[PDB]
Structures are given as C-alpha cells and as structure tokens.
Design a protein around this ligand. Structure first.
Ligand SMILES: NC[C@H]1O[C@@H](n2cnc3c(N)ncnc32)[C@H](O)[C@@H]1O
Ligand SMILES: NC[C@H]1O[C@@H](n2cnc3c(N)ncnc32)[C@H](O)[C@@H]1O
Ligand SMILES: NC[C@H]1O[C@@H](n2cnc3c(N)ncnc32)[C@H](O)[C@@H]1O
Ligand SMILES: NC[C@H]1O[C@@H](n2cnc3c(N)ncnc32)[C@H](O)[C@@H]1O
Lengths: 342, 343, 343, 343
C-alpha cells in the first residue's frame, strides 16, 4: 500500500499503539474547543449530511461518526487502524446505531469500501498542522469521494510570525552549556558542545505565549484539501516576507494554524492562534541558533521548507534574512520530537 | 543474533533512537547519585582495575570507560549500539585516551571482541531493575569474561512492600469516570468505563512517596550476576509473605532496587529506596484492583510473577491474599508503558 | 629607583594622572566608612602619635596627615607623587599646620627624609586589596621606620569564598555569544567565539551581593605588613579548602578584605565584607568559565595564584577542584581591568 | 615616523591597548546606525568598489573590509595598528577571503603598501569628530591614493549650537562646594573650592540631551577630506555667529557631527545630531564659565579654537560675546578627559 511505501514499520507500530489508549482518546475529547467546534461545524451544516454516505478517516473513539449520525447521515463508514476500532463498535452498539455507523478496521490506504461517499470527515491535524503526516491519508481517501463531494475540514491555513523571547532562548542555552565543561568528573565534554547546541535547537518548542512577543503581521500559507494531491505534501515550501513593526532581536518563528469547514449553510473556523482560546495543539516556536537584529521598518525575508521523512513527520529547514543588512540565520528542526514547555 | 530473537525490530529501533540523544545522556549524567556512586565504586576499588582489561557494556557517552581509565585500566572495550557511539569516539580522542579506550559500535550480542576481559562494567538497570531487559545483554557479555572475572554491578536487589495510598487508588477511578456519562455531546460513553478502568490499572505508577505509607518490612529478591544466566530473567517468580506492621487497606505493592559493587577493597551500594536520596529511577507502585484489609499482625501472602515480552519489557502478575480472612486480590500490569506521576 | 624597575612608564603616567584630580580625592573622601574608620583608628590610638615623627605614604589630599596632627604628632612627613601634593600644601597652610605637616613631593622610593620615623600611616589598599600594587610602596617605606616602629594598617586579611549566581554567569555568556553569530551583516564571526569568552571571563566583577549566595564559610589569607618584605608581594599563592554548606553550582570565588589598625589603646578593623556596610571598594568576584557542581559535605580545594605585573596590578590564576569527583575548573583574570556592575 | 613625532608614547600605548579588546569592537559593531549606514554607503555605491583596489584605514575587526568585499572589490589592504589585527586575519580566513583581503599590521604612517589604491575607507571620527586625532591618519593615507580617487567618508561637518541647561551648570558647583566646608572631619577644605570649580569646567560633558535646550540654529564647519591636508587639522578655527531663536541664559556650546559618503550612485549621511537616533558618539557640551543673557533675535558671536596636543586630543578655547550687550564669556577645555554624564 501507499502507506507502507512512505513509512518505517517502527514508526507506524509506535504511532498506532499510541492511539490505541483510551486515555489519549479522553485527552483529545476533553478539548472543548476542538470537540465543540467539530460538532458546531457538522450540525449547523447538517444538510450536507442529511441522508448521505459519509467516510470518517481515523474515527478513533468514533465521536465524529456520532456527530454525522446526529446530523442525519444515511450511513457512516468509520475507518480506524488502531485497536480503538474495537472500542468504537462497542459504543456504536450501546448507542443503537449499528444500522447507520459501520466500523471498518484498517488503514484507509488498505481497506476496501462498499461505495463512493458524499463527504469525508476527519481530524488530520497535528502539531504545526502537518505533523504525523495524516493529511496524506486524508487526501488518499479522496479516491472514495464523488466528483460532487465535500471535505470536512475543507482548507488549512498555516500562520507564521517572528517573535522575541530572551527567556526561552537562554533556557535552551543554559541546557547546552552542560557540554562546554572542561572537567566533568575529570572528563572533557567540550568537544561535543557543537553537537549539543544543534540538538537542543533542533527541538520545536510546544507551548503558548503572550502575543506581544510577536514583531510583525503574520504570513499565511493555505492548503485546499479538495483540490490538493498526496504528492503535494512530500515537500512544502513556505516563503515569507515580514514587515517589522518593532525593533529588537528576532529569536525565531511562531507557528499556528486555522482550518475551515466550508459547508452549504455556513463556514466554521477552528483556530489555534494565540489570540484564540487554547487547544491541545497549543502553538509551536522554532528558535534560531543565533538571533537576528532588525529595526522597525526593516524586512525579514526567507523560506520555511518541510520535507517528509519515513518516520511519519517532516524535517524543517528555516532560512531567514534581514534584507537591509544581509544578516542571515538558519536552523534545521525535527518536528517529530518537540519540547513541551507548558 | 541472540538479541534480535528476543526483540521486535520496531521496539529496538525506537529504543536506540531514544538513547542516541545527548539530552538523554545529560539527564543520566546529571544524576549525582548514579554518576557519583559509579565513580566511587570504581576509584575506591582501583585494585580491581589497575592494569586490567575492561569491557563497558552500553557505555553511551563513555563516562564509565573514563572512570575505569582513571582507575588505571590497561584497556577498555566500550560497546554501544546507538548513534551515541560516534560521539563517544570523539570524547575519547579529545581526552587523549585512544590508546586505552576502544569504542566498538554495535550490539553486545553481535560484536566480536579481540580478547577476553578481566571485568565487565555497565548500568543495565531500568525501572523496577528489570525494565528495558538490558540485564540480559549484561549477562550475555559474560561470554567474554575470564573465569574469576568480576562484574560491576555484582548483585541486584529488588524490594517489594505493601503500601496504602487511598488518593492514588481513587485517582484512577476519577479519571476513568470520564467515560461514565450518558450524553457527552449527545453520545453515551458509559459502555467503555470498564475498559478505561482496566487500562489505568495496568499502568505501573512512577513517582516517589513517603515511607509512612508502607505497611510492612520489604521482601527482597536477589540476582547474582556472577552466577546468573540469561534464561533466568525470562520468568521471575517472587513469592512474598508480609507481616503487617500497621492495620489498614493495602492498595498495592511498591518496588525499588539496590545494586552492589563488590570489589577487593570495599563494597559500594547504590540504592533507589524511598529512604535514600531520589534518583531518575524513582520508585514504582502497582495497584491491586481491589484493596485488601489487613490487621496488624495478619499475614499477606502471594506471588509476583514477571514474564519478559518482546517489547523489551515485562508483564507483571501480582496475586495476594490475607491468610486470616481469605480476602484475595490480583492485578496484571504492563511495565513497558508506566504512568509518570511525579511532580 | 625601585619603582621604575617594577613599573611601565605608560601605566605610571596614567596612574598618577588619575590621582591628580580633586574629583577623585572627593570620591575617596566621601566614603564615610573609609574616612571615619581611619579617623577612629588614629584618634583612639592617639598615644601612638603624640609627640612622634610620622610618615604618611601617598597622603593625596593630606587627610590622614591632618588626623595625625589632631592626634598630636610632633611632625608628619607627607609623601605624594602626583600633582595633588601642590593642593595638599594649600590645605596645610589654610589650616595653620606648617609647623607639623611637611609635604614631600615625589615617590616614596625616591625621596630623602631628614630622619627615621616612629609610625607609618597609609591607605595602600586597592580592589581585592592588592590592585595598584601600592602595598609594595608601603613596605618599601619601612626603610625609614625605626626598629620598634608601627604601621597603620598593621595587617591585612583577604577572604575568599565560593558563590552561586546563575544570572551573573549567563550575563557574561550572553555578552560573549555575540561572537557566535554565523552571519553578522553577512560576516561569520564564530571563529572568534573562543577569544570572546576568554576576554569577558578575564574580567573580575566589582559590585555587591547578598551573603546568601555564598556556598561555604570563607578562607582567610593574612599579610602582616610589619614583617613582610616587597619580594613577598611579587607572587602570592593562596591555597584554599572549602567545606560546602549547600549543594549547588559554584560559579566562582568572591573576594573581600579586612585591614586592622593595631594601636596601643585598641584595635580598629576596616572591612569590605558583604555582611558590613558598603565601601568604594565593594566586593570582587571571579567567575569560572564553567561552573562546578558540589554536594553539601564535599570539599572544594585549589589555589589562587597572584603574580604582579608591570602595569601596577596582578594576573590572577584560580584553579579549583571538587576532591570527591575530580571536577576541575580554571580561570585567568586581569585585575587591572574590572567589570563595574554596580547600580 | 609621522605618527610618533606628534604623539607622546604614553598616550599611544594606552590608545592601542583600548582598541585591542573584542569587547569594544563589539560595542562599536552593535551600533546599528554606524554599521548599517556604512554598509548602505558601500553597497549602494557598489560601482565605486567592483574590481577596484581598496585601502581600509584602522579596519579593527575588519568589518568595513568585508563590506568592500561584498561590493565587489578586487583587493583590500586592511591596516590595523592594535592587536585586533591578529583577530582580523582569523576572520579573513574563516570567511574565505584570503584571496582579496590582506591584513597589514602596523600604523598607516609606518607600514609599506605595494600600490596606489582607488578608494580609501575608514571610520576615523571621535567625540566632537576630531578626538583621537585619527582624521590626520586618514588624510595621511592619501599618499597611497591615486588622483581622482575617492574617500569614504568624503566630507565631515562639525555642528555648533548654544544651549541652556541650568541644572548642568549648577551641578558643577554642587560638586565643588563639597570643598567649601570649615570642618570635614576637623579639616578646613575651603581653600581648594576654587581649584575644584576650575577642574570641573575644563571637562567637556559627554551625554545626550533634549533638543529644546538649543538656543539657535547650529553653525557648521566643513572638512572636505579629498582636498584637505593633515596640516589643516592641527589648528581648527571655527568662528560663529548665532542668531538666537529664544531669549534666555546661554550656558555653553553643544557639539555634534555629520559625515557624508559621496559615491557615484548616491550620497549617504551619518549624523550624530540630537534629533537623530543615539550613537556611541553621543553629543558633547562645553560650559562657559559665566552664562550670557541673549534676547531672541540678538547675535551671539565668537570663536571656537581647537589646538592639537601630544595626547592625541585637542585643547578647546571658546570665546563668545553678545554683540548687543557687550556681555562676554570664555572657557578653555581638555577634550582628552571628558565627563561621561549619560544616565
Ligand atoms: N487522529 C488520529 C486518529 O486517526 C487514525 N489514523 C491515523 N492514520 C490512519 C490511517 N492511515 N488509516 C486509518 N486511520 C488512521 C489514528 O489511528 C488515530 O486514531
Ligand atoms: N545506559 C543505556 C545505554 O546502554 C545501551 N545499550 C542497551 N542495550 C545494548 C546492547 N544490547 N548493546 C550495546 N549497547 C546497549 C543503550 O544504547 C544506551 O546507550
Ligand atoms: N593611595 C593612593 C595615593 O597615594 C599616591 N601614591 C601611589 N603610589 C605612590 C608612590 N609610589 N609614592 C608616593 N605616592 C604614591 C597616589 O598618587 C594617590 O594619591
Ligand atoms: N576605528 C578605530 C580603529 O582605528 C585604528 N587606528 C587608529 N589609528 C591608527 C593608525 N595610525 N594606524 C592604523 N590603525 C589605526 C584603531 O586601532 C582602531 O582599531
């Protein structure tokens, strides 16, 4: 299947074992913003579901299937690759919905569905949206979608903005300074300081923050899931040009994302922006190894490049430059292994 | 190899990737208890190391090799399976020790050493001592040990004790009761309440605790690494009989361990007992599904059975009964995925 | 002369230029602790001055000579090498003391005095006591001292103790990190990162601090000016052994000093200890380039080595080691060019 | 050499020791105004640099040379007299520019250069522009300049303006009045009050100020470095006639400067005016001994005379007169030792 072609067995096993735990399902579900927003999107666009065939990709506990059933769907095919699939059917039976919700265990890239569907629903967003590479399974599932079909979510917006946070930068450097020691119990570790600094700064920082640290209006990169193809997500190049509102040191880039459910009756947005209520996604920040000084009015231009790897994630290379001075900074990040600071 | 037959590749890859991070080496190294005690054990027993051949199993950063070098070792073969090895060779060079420390990348079950060694050193202990199943690699390495060779650590003590902690026990039901509601956004989740409970009780709890929660003197099970074989660690049966010091409800068993370095000059102990300073191992507690009432003076008898799995960990089966009342309780735990509760 | 042989002309010119300013005399004089403490020492030991011949080395404005005159000295020879000598004579005249205070312009190593003296007074202390190397001029002056004569101050005590201050350390590391930039306006500065760190950490930090940052009771090094010779101050080796009271990171050593005026009537102390009221000397701290971790009970041993240079100051070499672990740290500091952190 | 004949060795030693510190290079480089403006001037006039020979006088770290290299210079001779030169060559190698940048240690008046150059670049400006007397080294370098060559900066403007700051003027007497007391610890200091006053008024004040204290449009004296000779800078006579915008007491003159880079493509200005963002040069103020009252519309006429001394600085003589009143005031200052008042 296309899934095994793009994934190390080691990672996939780990991935689906993680999602096999009810405690994780609980964590996801107790996010009122996430769960409530999904329900609002489905129910207020109920006409897009009424008496229709639905495909739910990565149903987990099955919550989204139930929303679709509440909206009046004729039949929901709920596909789930973890052992959660067995718990889902238990809920379907105890909620008397066996005539309407059909759980199909397996990967959407590997299962056979009885028929094409009118709409696909899913929650494929990870940290920075793209983490876990579930967006490609979501787009793969489009093979079962009718020409006149819809997708929930319909589009995705990545938001980038430069930030200043001296406290965060010093925190990571305080940790790396361990490896600068000339005599730790009589051992010289200093030969590895270079390696240590790189590794710590290779960590995306997951947490929330006050928006006053943002130094410029954010830049947006939009993905339309209805027209996009699987191949489009192997290499994502996000160019940016910021016009600085404040003078100071830029310590990195901040990331968050919006998704929109564009239904017939109305459009519902789900945002993880720092101006919005917190979600289990929080926000993501990537530190530069060396800060860049920029005056207000200067322009900070560069590229954020995401290249998919076989561990179900992306390698992030960020290059940034102050156009007036030529001061340039780089960083390479491993999105798979973040630093949770909350 | 002997390693690949007892480990799923999936688990092994994730395992060695974890140990390839300098941040992880740093966490271990900043444990003064662990690192300080090892140095003390080696340096205070310099006679066991001076002009000897040494094998360091899972050297990681190589810290233990350097200690052996400080103690006067003739040659140290440092074996490391993760990408930490490439970093180890760097430190050996920058510390001018290439003539004495030889880094050998690979798994100890798969590499070939040029010669037999006088002593083997290592830090193979995981949670509850046995977690990660590295102890089997440590014992495997004995194929390279000369007769009359020594091992650092030399012996291991697992300790079991019954405890009472009403809040820990009740916490598990507060969490699972999330699933006991008839309309979560219009959905009846109650059907999964049972499974949720089961899931939470299969998790060993990692954290520390006040020694006053202990209901009896601990029972210890000893592994002597000098006589032990790999096969001895696939099935570990720890029978126990506790004589209760306090009356109350027993909610589970607490585990910790000691290791001893037995050298010519002296014996050095490394303990993770709750009476001792805290380590990155902390302590481990396993809850019973149902608490047992025990009088002071009553006897709590039963068995703790550890069965190794191919995910580099153990399945724990605990059954206990109060002999005077016949009240019986059991539990099954998966040590591979504990609940880190410390705060 | 002995002064020109131990001093660069470039440094000497700037040095005596500095003390030629009335604004600097004012700063010294407005140190109530210093000036008041000196007056207490001289007047309360007035019997050591009554009808005696006095030599005041580096009188500056002449303030100590006036103290001596108040105490009843028959005659005071006041030696001053800067142009301040011209101002001193103005005060001597406007205060009608020409019969008792005689200003001698020149360096104490070069002037000729009519007679031997009973007591020498002076303020030869700089930062960390030894900076400015005036103590050698003070000791040189003993050639004019009678066999049974006295010296004010009589003895000096240097105190050193380890401290912890994460914020001070990161401040200096933050400053040096400028040179780690890979593209400053398109230029790679990283090649100088090493040189930058060295330069910044070579600076002793002058400021005050909370005594709670000290990690152990201080060690004392005493200089007795009555028996000491100049040659003793060219190389000062201060060994130390601290018994750690608290566990934590040691970021450096803190220095302060006491001097004592031991007269016939009583002993008066002048202290720049952080437990005492502040002076224009403040305290001095020397950072290690890399901190050392020590538990409470461990011992921190090492050496502070002071070597006098031709710029009228000292080069400081500090080596420290945690005896139990072997963790070692060093640093070289240039006392002549401090970092003033004071508010 | 031409440099040694106009400088006492004592000052020269101290001068080049100062610029040998990376900490000061950093201080200069972190001035965005200075460094940014220089880069703008060089890169936006790239046609003045592409494939030409450049001479960089007092390159320090070499930053300006790297800019010239970015603009496309074929070869840059970078001259540096301090020990910074060794650091410069290190950067040249690590930035892989050894084929184009040649670092020449030594004074520009003493070194040997192989060839004539197309353009000279440098940042020779001190406080009040002329301080440090490096502008004379900049002009000396024209012996290596081809006719029709260019100079970056090309011209320099010093700006003069009258100001009012009653608190600054009164501050000097508050400080000097320390000496006006009949019993400081029993000593009458009053005889030195006059000397103290004189000393404070000879110090030009370095800091910044609000432009609302300025009493008239500034008067400017221009130095065009392309036709100017070294000899033009030994005696600078700046006559001035201010037309007062405000009525009030004038306490002195404020100084700042502009330099312009006149290239083929465009002209770039670097200004230290108080209306502009602050720089590490700040502004300079020189007090009159007695304030002068001037009505708005009145004319304040006089002369500012700068006379070079052997301490690499200037003696400033200011004479001013209110033409309508005949009210006259003067002052003589030593720019070598300013008073840093900032914050
Ligand atoms: N939001 C995450 C949920 O979606 C499930 N999932 C991830 N990849 C999948 C896939 N390729 N096929 C079916 N379900 C998948 C995954 O098992 C988890 O339950
Ligand atoms: N202290 C933990 C260290 O021991 C290493 N390790 C575990 N099993 C190993 C094995 N079988 N061969 C070599 N190194 C091993 C493991 O890679 C880690 O670096
Ligand atoms: N305590 C410092 C004061 O004493 C003066 N001084 C420093 N070294 C001296 C010296 N070697 N001879 C005479 N006076 C000296 C120095 O000029 C200053 O005024
Ligand atoms: N911008 C300040 C830089 O200019 C250097 N400098 C001053 N006078 C010099 C001189 N005469 N020759 C070479 N470099 C000189 C001075 O050493 C410093 O590095």
């Amino acid at each position: 299947s296309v899934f095994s072609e793009r994934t190390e067995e080691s990672s996939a096993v780990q991935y689906f074992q993680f999602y096999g735990y009810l405690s994780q399902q609980q964590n996801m579900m107790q996010d009122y913003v996430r769960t409530g927003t999904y329900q609002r999107a489905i129910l207020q666009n109920h006409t897009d579901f009424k008496d229709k065939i639905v495909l739910d990709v990565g149903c987990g506990s099955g919550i989204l299937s139930f929303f679709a059933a509440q909206a009046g769907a004729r039949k929901i095919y709920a596909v789930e690759a973890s052992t959660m699939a067995q718990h889902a059917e238990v809920l379907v039976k105890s909620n008397n919905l066996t005539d309407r919700i059909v759980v199909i265990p397996g990967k959407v890239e590997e299962v056979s569905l009885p028929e094409q569907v009118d709409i696909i629903i899913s929650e494929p967003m990870g940290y920075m949206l793209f983490n876990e590479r579930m967006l490609e399974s979501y787009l793969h599932a489009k093979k079962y979608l009718k020409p006149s079909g819809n997708m929930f979510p319909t589009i995705g917006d990545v938001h980038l903005a430069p930030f200043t946070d001296e406290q965060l930068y010093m925190e990571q450097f305080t940790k790396a300074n361990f490896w600068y020691q000339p005599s730790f119990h009589g051992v010289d570790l200093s030969a590895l300081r270079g390696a240590a600094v790189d590794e710590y700064f290779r960590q995306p920082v997951v947490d929330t923050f006050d928006i006053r640290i943002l130094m410029a209006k954010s830049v947006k990169y939009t993905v339309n899931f209805l027209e996009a193809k699987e191949g489009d997500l192997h290499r994502i190049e996000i160019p940016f040009k910021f016009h600085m509102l404040h003078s100071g040191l830029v310590h990195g880039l901040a990331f968050w994302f919006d998704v929109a459910f564009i239904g017939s009756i109305m459009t519902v947005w789900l945002s993880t922006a720092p101006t919005e209520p917190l979600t289990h996604w929080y926000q993501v920040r990537c530190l530069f190894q060396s800060p860049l000084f920029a005056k207000a009015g200067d322009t900070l231009s560069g590229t954020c490049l995401l290249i998919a790897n076989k561990r179900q994630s992306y390698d992030i290379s960020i290059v940034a430059q102050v156009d007036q001075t030529g001061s340039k900074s780089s960083n390479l990040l491993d999105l798979k292994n973040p630093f949770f600071r909350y």
